[PDB]
C-alpha cells in the first residue's frame, strides 16, 4: 500500500505497541496509551526516565525499502458455533433424492449415504445428529427444516 | 489544511514574564507533539520545548528548564510558552511546531524534523 499509506516526507499516521508488560493472547486487543514503567520507579502518567510511551509511528515515505514500505493486511477468521451456518460460499444447491446411495454435502457436511425420512426428535435448535462413533447420523436439511 | 499561528511575542525587561500562544485548525496532535522553537537573527534554529497532547508531559532545553513551561488546552487546541526570568539570548523569532510523528521516547522531539509550523512571533529581552 506504498501508493496510498506513504507520502512526501513521511506518513506517521499509523502506529505499532513497543512496550508491554507480557505478550498478548490470541485476538487480544489493547488500546491502552498507559506510561511503559521500564523500572522500579512509579511514573504515575509521567514520562522520564524509565518512562515511556507504549506506542510509536512507521516512517512510510514512497522512497522506503520493500521492506519498510507499507502493507494493508486483513486476516480472515472462520467460525463454527453452537449455531446455524450462515457464511456460505457460492457453490449452487441441488434437488434432493431419498433412498438412495448419494454423495451428500449439507452446508459443507459432506459424506455419502443413504437419506431417508426419519423419525427422530430434534429440538428446534439440533442442526445434526451424530452416533456413538462421532459420525453423522441424521441431519437438517438448511432449506427444509 | 493545517495552521499553526503564534501571537503574545513582544518587549520585556529581563527578569520578567512573557505567554505566547499557538493556535492549531485542520487537526489535533493526538498521540504525538507540539513544540517551540526560536531562531535569533544570524543564529541557527534552536529547540526550546516539547510537550506530548495526550498525556501533557514535557520536555525542555537546558537553556530554559525551569524557566519557561510549555502547557496545551485540548479544548482551545493551542499550546502556550510561559517565559519566566526572561533573559537578554532568549531574543529571539519564536515558532510553534506540530510533530504528526508518534515517537515512544520524548526526547526524540528535541531533534525530531517538524512537518508544521506557525509563522513565528518576535521576542525582545531589553536589559
Known amino acids: 500500500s506504498n501508493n496510498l499509506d506513504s507520502k512526501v516526507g513521511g506518513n506517521y499516521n499509523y502506529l505499532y505497541r513497543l512496550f508491554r508488560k507480557s505478550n498478548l493472547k490470541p485476538f487480544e486487543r489493547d488500546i491502552s496509551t498507559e506510561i511503559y514503567q521500564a523500572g522500579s520507579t512509579p511514573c504515575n502518567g509521567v514520562e522520564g526516565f524509565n518512562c515511556y510511551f507504549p506506542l510509536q509511528s512507521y516512517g512510510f515515505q514512497p522512497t522506503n525499502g520493500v521492506g519498510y514500505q507499507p502493507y494493508r493486511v486483513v486476516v480472515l477468521s472462520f467460525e463454527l458455533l453452537h449455531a446455524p451456518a450462515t457464511v456460505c460460499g457460492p457453490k449452487k444447491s441441488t434437488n434432493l433424492v431419498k433412498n438412495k446411495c448419494v454423495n451428500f454435502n449439507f452446508n459443507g457436511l459432506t459424506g455419502t449415504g443413504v437419506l431417508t425420512e426419519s423419525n427422530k426428535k430434534f429440538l428446534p435448535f439440533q442442526q445434526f445428529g451424530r452416533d456413538i462413533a462421532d459420525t453423522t447420523d441424521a441431519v437438517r436439511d438448511p432449506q427444509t427444516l | 489544511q493545517v495552521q499553526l499561528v503564534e501571537s503574545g511575542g513582544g518587549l520585556m525587561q529581563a527578569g520578567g514574564s512573557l505567554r505566547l500562544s499557538c493556535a492549531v485548525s485542520?487537526?489535533?496532535?493526538?498521540?504525538?507533539?507540539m513544540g517551540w522553537f526560536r531562531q535569533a537573527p544570524g543564529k541557527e534554529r534552536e529547540f526550546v520545548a516539547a510537550?506530548?497532547?495526550?498525556?501533557?508531559?514535557?520536555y525542555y532545553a537546558d537553556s530554559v528548564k525551569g524557566r519557561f513551561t510549555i502547557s496545551r488546552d485540548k479544548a482551545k487546541n493551542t499550546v502556550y510558552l510561559q517565559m519566566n526570568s526572561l533573559k537578554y539570548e532568549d531574543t529571539a523569532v519564536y515558532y510553534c511546531a506540530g510533530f504528526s510523528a508518534t515517537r515512544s521516547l520524548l526526547s526524540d522531539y528535541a531533534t525530531w524534523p517538524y512537518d508544521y509550523w506557525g509563522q513565528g512571533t518576535q521576542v525582545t529581552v531589553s536589559s
Open positions: 510537550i506530548r497532547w495526550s498525556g501533557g508531559s514535557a
Open positions: 485542520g487537526r489535533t496532535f493526538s498521540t504525538a507533539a
